[PDB]
Write an enzyme that holds these catalytic residues in place. Structure first.
Site, PDB file in Angstrom:
ATOM      1  CG  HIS A  41      -0.413   0.236   2.698  1.00 19.61           C
ATOM      2  ND1 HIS A  41      -1.333   0.854   3.266  1.00 19.61           N
ATOM      3  CD2 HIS A  41       0.404   0.029   3.183  1.00 19.61           C
ATOM      4  CE1 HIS A  41      -0.894   1.290   4.230  1.00 19.61           C
ATOM      5  NE2 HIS A  41       0.847   0.989   4.600  1.00 19.61           N
ATOM      6  CB  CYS A  95       2.778   3.191   5.966  1.00 15.37           C
ATOM      7  SG  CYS A  95       2.645   1.811   6.532  1.00 15.37           S
ATOM      8  CD  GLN A 113      -6.908   0.941  11.162  1.00 16.44           C
ATOM      9  OE1 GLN A 113      -6.501   1.643  10.728  1.00 16.44           O
ATOM     10  NE2 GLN A 113      -8.269   1.667  11.217  1.00 16.44           N
ATOM     11  CB  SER A 136      -4.339   4.291   9.410  1.00 18.69           C
ATOM     12  OG  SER A 136      -4.084   3.121  10.370  1.00 18.69           O
ATOM     13  CG  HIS A 139      -4.839   2.638   3.346  1.00 13.93           C
ATOM     14  ND1 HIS A 139      -3.327   2.602   3.927  1.00 13.93           N
ATOM     15  CD2 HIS A 139      -5.301   3.477   3.906  1.00 13.93           C
ATOM     16  CE1 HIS A 139      -3.527   2.363   4.745  1.00 13.93           C
ATOM     17  NE2 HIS A 139      -5.250   3.245   5.480  1.00 13.93           N
TER      18      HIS A 139
HETATM   19  O1  LIG Z   1      -1.919   2.233   7.622  1.00 15.00           O
HETATM   20  C1  LIG Z   1      -2.146   0.547   7.879  1.00 15.00           C
HETATM   21  C2  LIG Z   1      -1.979   0.289   9.429  1.00 15.00           C
HETATM   22  C3  LIG Z   1      -0.542  -0.237   9.424  1.00 15.00           C
HETATM   23  C4  LIG Z   1      -1.020  -1.627   8.375  1.00 15.00           C
HETATM   24  C5  LIG Z   1      -0.896  -1.191   6.840  1.00 15.00           C
HETATM   25  C6  LIG Z   1      -2.177  -0.024   6.581  1.00 15.00           C
HETATM   26  C7  LIG Z   1      -3.490  -0.869   7.606  1.00 15.00           C
HETATM   27  C8  LIG Z   1      -3.914  -1.372   8.387  1.00 15.00           C
HETATM   28  O2  LIG Z   1      -4.275  -2.069   9.675  1.00 15.00           O
HETATM   29  C9  LIG Z   1      -2.316  -2.063   9.358  1.00 15.00           C
HETATM   30  C10 LIG Z   1      -2.660  -0.410  10.045  1.00 15.00           C
END
Ligand SMILES: O=C1[C@@H]2C[C@@H]3C[C@H]1C[C@@](O)(C3)C2
Ligand SMILES: [Cl-]
Length: 145
Positions: A41, A95, A113, A136, A139
């Site tokens: 992502h 991230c 999530q 967060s 994405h």
């Molecule tokens: O930004 C994000 C956080 C960290 C990991 C990738 C993405 C989705 C998540 O659930 C897992 C929360």
């Protein structure tokens, strides 16, 4: 139609296209579950992110709307081929997975999530999402396996 797809009409051109309300993907052609999937992502955080901080920026201040504009611009560049997903993830994802070209590894349902999980499992292998919203941030998700 495969899970979550609907027919839509282009406002500028009048041509039929297809939209997925789980992944926020849209495409011109008619669209073509596993225990686990593997995804990368690219995350763009905003001032309402659950943790408005990243390796790129100690204090993330951009609005949710500004984050969406950034995400949409990255999607344009990936789809035109001017830039690769992995290159943009490494440079601009908010991230920690940026350092892994955005790769998150393989995962099951019930770990991520919910909007992220639902989009991940609705993508076909190799397919990319549109903007996906979570606590967060926003994405772009690439299913790799
Ligand atoms: O930004 C994000 C956080 C960290 C990991 C990738 C993405 C989705 C998540 O659930 C897992 C929360
Ligand atoms: Cl598949």
């Amino acid at each position: 139609l495969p899970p979550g797809w609907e027919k839509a009409m282009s406002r500028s051109s009048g041509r039929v296209y297809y939209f997925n309300h789980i992944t926020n993907a849209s495409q011109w052609e008619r669209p073509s579950e596993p225990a686990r999937v593997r995804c990368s992502h690219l995350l763009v955080k905003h001032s309402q992110s659950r943790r408005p901080s990243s390796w790129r920026q100690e204090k993330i201040t951009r609005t949710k709307e500004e984050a969406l504009e950034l995400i949409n611009g990255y999607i344009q560049k990936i789809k035109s081929g001017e830039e690769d997903f992995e290159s943009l993830a490494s440079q601009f994802s908010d991230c920690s997975s940026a350092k892994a070209r955005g790769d998150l590894g393989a995962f099951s349902r019930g770990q991520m999530q919910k909007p992220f999980e639902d989009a991940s499992f609705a993508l076909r292998t190799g397919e990319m999402s549109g903007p996906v919203f979570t606590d967060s941030g926003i994405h772009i998700i690439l299913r790799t396996e």
